[PDB]
Amino acid sequence: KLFETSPFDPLTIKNNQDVVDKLYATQSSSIQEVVPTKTFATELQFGVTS
Amino acid sequence: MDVLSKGSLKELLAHLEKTPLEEAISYRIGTVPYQNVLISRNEYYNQLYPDTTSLIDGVSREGQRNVNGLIMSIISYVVSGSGHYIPNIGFMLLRRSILDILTKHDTGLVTNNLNYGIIARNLTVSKMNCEQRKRMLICFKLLAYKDGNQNDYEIYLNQNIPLKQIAPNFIPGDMRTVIHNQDQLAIVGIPAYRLTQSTELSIRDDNAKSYKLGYVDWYNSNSFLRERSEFNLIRLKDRDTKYGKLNGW
Amino acid sequence: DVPFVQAYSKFADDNPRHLRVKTGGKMANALTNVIRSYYSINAPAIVPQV
Amino acid sequence: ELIKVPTIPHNLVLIQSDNGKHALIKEDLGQWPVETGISLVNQAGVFAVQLANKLGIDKPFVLDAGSNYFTDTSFIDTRKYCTDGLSPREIQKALNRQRAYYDRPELTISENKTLLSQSIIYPDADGNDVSIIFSGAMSHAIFTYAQSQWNKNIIKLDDYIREITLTVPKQYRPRRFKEIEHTHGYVYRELNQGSLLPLVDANLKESSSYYFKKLMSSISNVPVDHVSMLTNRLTTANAPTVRAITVLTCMFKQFRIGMTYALDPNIMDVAAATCMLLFRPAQSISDEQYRYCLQTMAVFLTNTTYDIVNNDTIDVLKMKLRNQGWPFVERYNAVEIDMSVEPLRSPGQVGRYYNPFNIDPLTKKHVEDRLEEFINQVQVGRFRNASGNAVGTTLAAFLRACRDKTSANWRGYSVLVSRYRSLIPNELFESLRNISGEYNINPQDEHSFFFALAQINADDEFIGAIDKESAEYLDEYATLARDISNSLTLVKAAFGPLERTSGSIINHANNLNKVINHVFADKPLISETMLKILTIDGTTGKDGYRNWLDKLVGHNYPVYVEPVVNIMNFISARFVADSSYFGYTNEIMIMPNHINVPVDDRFGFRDSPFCTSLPRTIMGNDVRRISYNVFSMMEDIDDVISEGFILYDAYFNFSYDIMTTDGVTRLKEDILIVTDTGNDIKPIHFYIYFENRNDKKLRYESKMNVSYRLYIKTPACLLPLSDYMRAQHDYVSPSSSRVYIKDPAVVYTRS
Amino acid sequence: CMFKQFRIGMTYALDPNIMDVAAATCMLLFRPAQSISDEQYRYCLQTMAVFLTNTTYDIVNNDTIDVLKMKLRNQGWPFVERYNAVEIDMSVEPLRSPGQ
């Protein structure tokens, strides 16, 4: 068996965004070179709205 | 190897500003050029393969002790990866950058009398490839704008139509032109095709292949800078910024 | 004037304005300099490929 | 977050007569009332937002219309047939009925195929899908312009990373994006930074007090791990407060601090004064405080009085102290350390901060190279008495304890200053000042702070707390910048300059209150963050905003024009330029029925009230033109109306409904109403019918029953069915391969 | 060990403790030098210098590897070098397939 848990089931994906969302969901099964945590933001701007 | 990996006008010009002139010259005596030689290529033939030595090979060769020889060594370093043997130039000139030698009057070198016909003939241009010719035309353009010989540069290009077709389009004093340029000037890089560990018959091709296989080893070594992984570890001075521009441009 | 406003905006990349000469924009400049280059080999090639 | 619009708004309706002879296409953008006597552009802006909301272009968006297609049954045809816009089947039916009236052959199969294939979707070189549909002109122009404005802030992820690569420190773990994000990732971000200077300069005391108090509350939570008079006064009760002052002095530029001494100085006051001059930045000590400290030392050591040295200059005071044997008469500049990364909200700038305790980072010692020699001088000095050396020995021992404490703890405090410095931008570093002296140091607290200096412990809780503060500060600065931009636009549009006249002052005050009452109703325009800044002095937030707005009138501050402002300016301009699209006109004509005026015969209406242009001359003579104000005031309107005239200088709102049957075209109400006060025009509503050209009854009714007619310019929304190719318009939808990243952060929060 | 293109790196606190220095020395001593980047090598030297020479990260930010090595050696720290790993030749027996 190539994978104990498949990265994504291809029949359930409809477009590119579907692949990335599934890859983020099944990333715990993989050996991550970086383990995610809270993100740090160094830039933020708010634009005027209608 | 580092110079041959530059793929854009921005990267190539940035590298020339950082590197000094001593990298362009070599302290190994080498041999003399324009000599018919018999070399050994045993993977293909049992006899000795004839070839002719030139200034474009990646091996150091003895060079003339004049301004003409100095410019030929600089262009050879850019288009081949190794320079020539011109010693006792002086520490004042050897400390300055390659770009400063090419496009600044403060260095003290006088290059007005240089003729592009013999320089192209000596730095054999019928044996260069498209990427090598583009780099040489960059050096000619930088020199021409240094001594105010833009008109002579244009006439030389108009005489040789193929050179005009591939001539890079940038003004040596303007940084916007360097940013907009999209020429591909890389002689070594990660190959899409299958690169094997085999010899080539010609001296130029064998040396070029050695640089290509050497770049692959360097690309996968620890000296390479992977921006996607360690962009926060580079210092702020050498970090990539769009506001960054060449000095005096 | 809506049809002309849309056509000029596409051609010139700026909206037409009163009290302005209505030159033609960047496309007009590129076309003019490209014509010069084709006629003679002594004419400069100044328009970037980008 | 980007909004993904599925369908294109076309706003097209087909109206055809029962006979089938006449058909037309109309844009229905609604009716918008316009009031005369006030500015038209000001009303247009209000209607611009409503129109943008109706079309769905108010918020940032992209168009997803590349999947709205089908495929024909023919094997040769591999084209995509768009389902958006007015359906080509509806036009086919309308054309189909028109031919039935004229006894003409029906539309052929080849002619049907050409018409039904007019709406298509095809891809371009860049991968985008362009849809060609039947839609109105005004809707297409506004929708396409909005797309151009929003797409300016949609950039590749690698382009976003290059912009912010100089703000990322080295203590945070890099984030690994997926391979799809790196090739096809896009983000919607606004990259223009607004200055906080307009608010800071106008209210320096309030802005400084707000940020200083916020920082101290955070710093005060950092974890840490003659002789009789000096040794009886040590207290560590206010050490956290003194610690925060120390970090503030080094993290800011010109954060002046002050100390007040007693009426009769003692050995403790001299110790505090020496510690202030030796271990605090010279940039944080003013000249007057320097003179006060020298005077305090002179009073005690030389046994003089404050009156004697009240008129003494700095150079004289130094000479007196040096003669007695006191060498500590100098203040020392701190050594500035450059930040490792570009500070926040300071593009292309280098941040710096002072090193605490005047320790040179290169030598890791005090900046004064004579410190050890000076302490020996104090130890062998005869102060305040003939002999005994009690004061000198006590001060020498106290000074040595401070020197060792500062040398051991300088690294810990330098790290604390550096981390808190990254919170504030460069503008706040150079602008904020300590006004009113709302932070001061007691002389006992100063000498207790340096004698009992505590090491700085950076636990995981402290690091996590600071990271939360960094996110809060970033949001706070972004919110403040937006409200500054909103305030600057409001002042420029609604206020003018003042004059030394009662009328101008009264006019300004009334307008100021009207604006303030409007901007605080419902959801306030201004955020709670700046209301806190303006309230910090105790005044009401509403009053504080009124004061700040008045100061801002006549400013020359540059304001960046954002995409939403560009969109509304476009809609406002087309509102004024093309009035017929929105149901109002600036000119009407009233004529008797027996006067034959040329009208628009394209649509086949019976006695059409629409003219291509209001005629310049009728029967060889120019048509009279009367303004509405003069017309309202006229008393001989009966004589004038007998010849017919043109009414202008007003905004006339009109409505009409096209009836498919045939009848007498007329108005709902009478044209005018005459009162003892003035004459007015009643609301205009046209009942328009199609004409059969051979009905004697309706010909007689129109000529004899109706005696006066009202004419307006032909509305541009109408378009004859024969010209249906004029509604063919293009729309570009970006490629479906793109992925939009909600969180574009490049690093994680872990050491 | 199996794949040469793979790399190892660690991120330290702004104020390193003795644990960070121990982690840095263990990585330098025991992980292959071919798997530690030049940027990572400088970062480890910076962390060692911050703890041992009593300096902050901003002071030693614009310091080369030669300067950091000299600073650490003057204090008495000899672990400033990367150590290459020996290569072990491995063979997979053929059995029913060509060997590797």
Q: Closest CB to C3: pick one of D137, D145, D577.
A: D137
**By the 8 A CB rule, do D171 and D457 touch?**
no
- D167/A16 Cβ within 8 A: no
DSSP D500: S
Here the tokens at position B238 are: 């050498």
CA A35 – CA D174 distance, rounded (Å): 10
CA D384 – CA D325 distance, rounded (Å): 11
For B237, nearest residue in chain E (alpha carbons): E62
DSSP D588: E
Pairing mode, if any, of strands B48-52 and B61-62? unpaired
From D715, D56, D749, select the one nearest D470 (Cα to Cα): D749
Here the tokens at position A3 are: 């994978």
**By the 8 A CB rule, do D251 and D428 touch?**
no
Please name the residue that has the structure tokens 């393969």: B49
| Ranges assigned E (strand) in D352-502 | 352-354, 359-360, 365-366
CA D60 – CA D55 distance, rounded (Å): 13
CA D48 – CA D557 distance, rounded (Å): 26
Phi, psi of B32 (to 5 degrees): -100, 150
| Distance of alpha carbon D165 from the chain centroid | 24
CA D60 – CA D146 distance, rounded (Å): 9
Q: Closest CB to E39: pick one of B221, B234, B237.
A: B234
**By the 8 A CB rule, do D665 and D689 touch?**
yes
Whether D138 and chain C come into contact, CB under 8 Å, resolves to: yes
- Residues of D with a Cβ under 8 Å from any E Cβ are 170-173, 337-340, 361, 364, 411-412, 414-415, 418-419, 458, 463, 750-751
- In A1-42, which ranges are continuous DSSP H helix? 16-25
Per-residue buried b or exposed e for D590-618, using 16+ beta carbons within 10 Å of the residue's own CB: bbeeeeeeebbebbbbbbbbbbeebbeeb
CA B219 – CA B69 distance, rounded (Å): 33
For B229, nearest residue in chain D (alpha carbons): D174
Tell me how close the Cα of B226 comes to any Cα of chain D, in angstroms.
12
Length reported for chain B: 249
Which residues make beta-bridge pairs with D626? D647
Amino acid of residue D592: P
**By the 8 A CB rule, do B6 and B12 touch?**
yes
CA D117 – CA A17 distance, rounded (Å): 32
Q: Closest CB to E14: pick one of D338, D339, D419.
A: D419
E67: left (phi over 0), alpha (psi -120 to 50) or beta: alpha
Neighbours of D344 (CB within 10 A): 22
From D354, D339, D346, select the one nearest D257 (Cα to Cα): D354
From D134, D97, D125, select the one nearest D16 (Cα to Cα): D97
CA B215 – CA B190 distance, rounded (Å): 8
**By the 8 A CB rule, do B84 and B28 touch?**
no
Here the tokens at position B28 are: 């190994």
**By the 8 A CB rule, do D430 and D253 touch?**
yes
Instruction: Give me the torsion for CA of D630, D636, D637, D642, rounded to 10°.
Output: -130
Distances (CA, A) of D182 to B109, D128, D165, D409: 47, 19, 16, 45
For testing contact with chain D, the best of E41, E58, E75 (most D CBs within 10 A): E58
Q: Which residues of D touch B231 (CB under 8 A)?
A: 161, 165, 168, 174, 746
Start-to-end CA span in chain B (Å): 26
**DSSP-assigned states of every residue in D120-177:** EEEE-TTS-EEEEEE--HHHHHHHHHHHHHHHTTEEEHHHHHHHTGGG--SSSEEP--
- E55/D337 Cβ within 8 A: no
Which residues make beta-bridge pairs with B48? B40
| Distance of alpha carbon E80 from the chain centroid | 9
Phi, psi of E53 (to 5 degrees): -90, 5
> Using alpha carbons only, how large is chain B's radius of gyration in Å?
19
Please name the residue that has the structure tokens 């919607």: D188
Helix (H, G, I), strand (E, B) or coil at D70: strand
Amino acid of residue E94: P
The shares of helix, strand and coil residues in chain B, as percent rounded to the nearest 5, are: 45, 5, 50
For D412, nearest residue in chain E (alpha carbons): E15
D10: exposed, middle or buried (Cβ count in 10 Å: 0-12, 13-18, 19+): buried
CA B154 – CA B141 distance, rounded (Å): 9
Q: Which residues of B touch E5 (CB under 8 A)?
A: 220
CA D547 – CA D532 distance, rounded (Å): 15
Q: Which residues of B touch E37 (CB under 8 A)?
A: 222, 224-226, 230
DSSP D705: T
- B232/D168 Cβ within 8 A: yes
Which residues make beta-bridge pairs with D592? D708
Here the tokens at position C38 are: 């084709």
Q: Closest CB to E58: pick one of D337, D458, D751.
A: D337
Neighbours of D421 (CB within 10 A): 21
- In D606-673, which ranges are continuous DSSP H helix? 628-633, 637-641
Q: What's the number of CA atoms in the CB half-sphere (13 Å) around residue B21?
A: 24
Q: Closest CB to D171: pick one of E13, E55, E59.
A: E13
Helix (H, G, I), strand (E, B) or coil at B72: helix
Here the tokens at position B22 are: 């001593």
For B244, nearest residue in chain D (alpha carbons): D348
- D337/E15 Cβ within 8 A: no
From E49, E100, E58, select the one nearest E79 (Cα to Cα): E49
**By the 8 A CB rule, do D107 and D96 touch?**
yes
Q: Which residues of D touch E37 (CB under 8 A)?
A: none
Which residues make beta-bridge pairs with B61? B31, B84
From B66, B67, B61, select the one nearest B85 (Cα to Cα): B61
Contacts of D240 (CB under 8 A, 6+ apart): D219, D220, D221, D222
CA D598 – CA D591 distance, rounded (Å): 12
Q: Which residues of D touch B10 (CB under 8 A)?
A: none
Helix (H, G, I), strand (E, B) or coil at B146: helix
CA D200 – CA D220 distance, rounded (Å): 25
Query: How many secondary structure helices (H) and strands (E) does chain E include?
Result: 3, 0
CA D261 – CA D150 distance, rounded (Å): 62
Contacts of D126 (CB under 8 A, 6+ apart): D735
E35: left (phi over 0), alpha (psi -120 to 50) or beta: alpha
Phi, psi of E91 (to 5 degrees): -130, 135
For Cα atoms D688, D690, D694, give the angle at the middle one, nearest 5 degrees: 130
Angle formed by the axes of helices D541-552 and D528-535, nearest 10°: 90
Amino acid of residue A13: I
CA D260 – CA D267 distance, rounded (Å): 15
- B230/E37 Cβ within 8 A: yes
Q: What is the resolution of this structure in A?
A: 2.9
**By the 8 A CB rule, do D116 and D89 touch?**
yes
Q: Which residues of D touch E55 (CB under 8 A)?
A: 361, 364, 411
Whether B239 and chain D come into contact, CB under 8 Å, resolves to: yes
Q: Chains B, C in contact: 3+ Cβ pairs under 8 A? A: yes
Tell me how close the Cα of C36 comes to any Cα of chain D, in angstroms.
28
- B177/C48 Cβ within 8 A: yes
Helix (H, G, I), strand (E, B) or coil at D688: strand
Distances (CA, A) of D707 to D524, D644, D672, D700: 55, 12, 13, 12
